Amino acid sequence: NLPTAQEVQGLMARYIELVDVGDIEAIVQMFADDATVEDPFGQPPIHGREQIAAFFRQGLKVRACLTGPVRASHNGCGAMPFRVEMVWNGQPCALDVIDVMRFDEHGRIQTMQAYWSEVNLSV
Amino acid sequence: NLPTAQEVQGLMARYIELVDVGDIEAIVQMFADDATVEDPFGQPPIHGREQIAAFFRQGLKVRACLTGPVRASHNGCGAMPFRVEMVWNGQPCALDVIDVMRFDEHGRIQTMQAYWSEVNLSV
């Protein structure tokens, strides 16, 4: 069902866990079959699991951690702050991002938006 | 004009500065005349400066600080994590919140949403 405020904190923390290990199949399955992702926000969305799996396969070998608590409401929404550490073309970077997610009546991610731009990159 | 990614970080940091000191007139003026606020999100919005000034007057004597960097995009949007420290009915609390804002073609807050619920309260 629509996750409660407490369920939203657990699902969102799991999500960062999965991104950190890089288990692409487990990440993809957290999304609804027709979920849409906007990352970075301002960018056109990617729709459906096929496109999301491709987006994630494209980006993972990273380290990701929650840098503060998951903020959650009573209507299936959540927002969380986190940092991603990578090494781009030999140089190590860090990216501070804030993800906002909406869950469906099944506890799956229906919509996701990531807020960040070059001003949040430390290369 | 539409603030750039860097302008969005400055405006949003100013905002927390103003909430921290409690300068209600200066806060109100950061919003568009017909801006809408949803705080906490999931709650019906308040529209226009009159209602926003009333909302803020109702809540201020607090301490507020940014707990991480402001995440900003190129389309006038920003998201930031912060903590508010108060003392409710004799007992001191803390509330972790994430605000998401959209700015207008003038650099004023057009829409604001705050994400938090009781799971983010430390009383």
From Swiss-Prot, chains A, B:
The active site is at Y15 (proton donor), D39 (proton acceptor). One of its GO terms (biological process) is steroid metabolic process. Pfam families: SnoaL_2. Changing Y15S: Reduces activity 20-fold. Changing W88A: Slightly reduces activity. Reduces protein stability. It catalyses: a 3-oxo-Delta(5)-steroid = a 3-oxo-Delta(4)-steroid. Changing D99N: Reduces activity 4-fold. Reduces activity 10000-fold. Changing L121A: Slightly reduces activity and reduces protein stability. Its EC number is 5.3.3.1. Keywords: Isomerase, Lipid metabolism, Steroid metabolism. Substrate binds at D99. Changing Y15F: Reduces activity 2000-fold. Reduces activity 10000-fold. Induction: By steroids. It comes from the Bacteria. One of its GO terms (molecular function) is steroid Delta-isomerase activity. Homodimer. This is Steroid Delta-isomerase. The gene is ksi.
